[PDB]
Design a protein around this ligand. Structure first.
Ligand SMILES: CCCc1cc(=O)n2nc(NCc3ccc(-c4ccccc4)cc3F)nc2[nH]1
Ligand SMILES: [Zn+2]
Length: 354
């Protein structure tokens, strides 16, 4: 069965790596906004999350849709946790450039994003070489969506950056000690964390934590051995299993994009289940590349068990249950259980389907 999966992976790589003018088109527009954004005192410190890497794709079944995050450092920062949600917070301070955005003691995501959209909206008309249209309609993150030419789309997200220790709700998260080491966990938790505009139970001016940089760093240094995937004897399939599970959710969502059943699920859920499995199976010997079909099945099985038991702890905030009844209702989880269980029983037709 691992042969059919490797074909799916090979076709995904082929569309990732093919020659495309799109990256320069996005980079051309993106570097314009960064220059213009910096002219404003409130956004003087804005910059790309991972500098050099604009080419981030949430959807791997659509290489035309891009996703860049603009970070903005906020020092002297102080957080208040909203409604015991463990993940949504108010931003308070201790002269700061974001003072035009306050409402009392609380930084207003509403006002900050409005100026953020305003600056971008003007700068993209000053680009008359290409027709760049700004998609509107409210939603905190992604703050804005641009359509460059036709069929090129960029989601721009603004994230606060804090160079302080992580919020107390992350104390028992990132449980990577027996997999990546306590030494690595110290190093990662020394890194900054980020805050993006988000509302629980989608209105309060709340921000949700984001550790995209931590996930990216782990994926590129991912074995218990330091030489994992550096030689022939130490080739693992951790990345392949994550790609296949992200692709499986996307394709099923496309299959039922006219329904509403999978609208509540996102890459967050499959990414979270995968990292839990890596914590369960910390040995490189449990992710051998020849065992790709068995390892992918184990990842699928864990996700189904999460669906049935309605328990998917956030990897960084263990008290946050992404599959709680309030967040996703039993009907949606039972539906996704039926589709995934069907797919596995028939060697996953959905990968071929779209
Ligand atoms: C490495 C594992 C995947 C991962 C990457 C990453 O970058 N992050 N960043 C946070 N931040 C905390 C957090 C984020 C989203 C939600 C959420 C999501 C949907 C609905 C409601 C709530 C809840 C939360 F507690 N979690 C993660 N997981
Ligand atoms: Zn590896």
């Amino acid at each position: 069965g691992a042969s059919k999966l490797r074909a799916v992976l090979e076709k995904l790589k082929l569309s990732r790596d093919d020659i495309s003018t799109a990256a320069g088109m996005v980079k051309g527009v993106v570097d314009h906004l960064l220059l213009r954004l910096k002219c404003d005192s409130a956004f003087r410190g804005v910059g790309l999350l991972n500098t050099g890497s604009y080419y981030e794709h949430v959807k791997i079944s659509a290489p035309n849709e891009f996703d860049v995050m603009f970070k903005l450092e906020v020092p002297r920062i102080q957080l208040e946790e909203y409604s015991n949600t463990r993940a949504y917070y108010f931003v308070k301070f201790k002269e700061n450039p974001l003072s035009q955005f306050l409402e009392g003691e609380i930084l207003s995501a509403s006002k900050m994003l409005s100026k953020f959209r305003k600056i971008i909206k003007e700068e993209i008309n000053d680009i008359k070489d290409t027709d760049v249209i700004m998609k509107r309609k409210r939603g905190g993150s992604p703050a804005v969506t641009l359509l460059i030419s036709e069929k090129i789309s960029v989601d721009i997200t603004l994230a606060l950056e804090s160079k302080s220790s992580w919020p107390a709700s992350t104390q028992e998260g990132l449980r990577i000690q027996n997999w990546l080491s306590a030494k690595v966990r110290k190093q990662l938790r020394l890194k900054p964390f980020y805050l993006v505009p988000k509302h629980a139970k989608e209105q309060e001016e709340t921000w949700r934590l984001s550790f995209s940089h931590i996930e990216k760093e782990i994926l590129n240094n991912h074995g218990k051995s330091k030489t994992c995937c550096e030689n022939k004897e130490e080739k693992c399939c951790r990345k392949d299993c994550l790609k296949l599970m992200k692709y499986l959710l996307e394709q099923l969502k496309e299959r039922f994009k006219d329904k509403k059943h999978l609208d509540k699920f996102s890459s967050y859920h499959v990414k979270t289940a995968f990292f839990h499995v890596c914590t369960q199976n910390p040995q490189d010997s449990q992710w051998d590349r020849k065992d790709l079909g068995l390892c992918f099945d184990n990842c699928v099985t864990y996700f189904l068990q999460c669906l049935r038991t309605e328990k998917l702890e956030n990897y960084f905030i263990p008290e946050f249950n992404l599959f709680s009844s309030n967040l996703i209702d039993k009907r949606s989880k039972e539906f996704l259980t039926k589709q995934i269980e069907y797919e596995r029983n028939n060697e996953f037709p959905v990968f071929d389907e779209f």
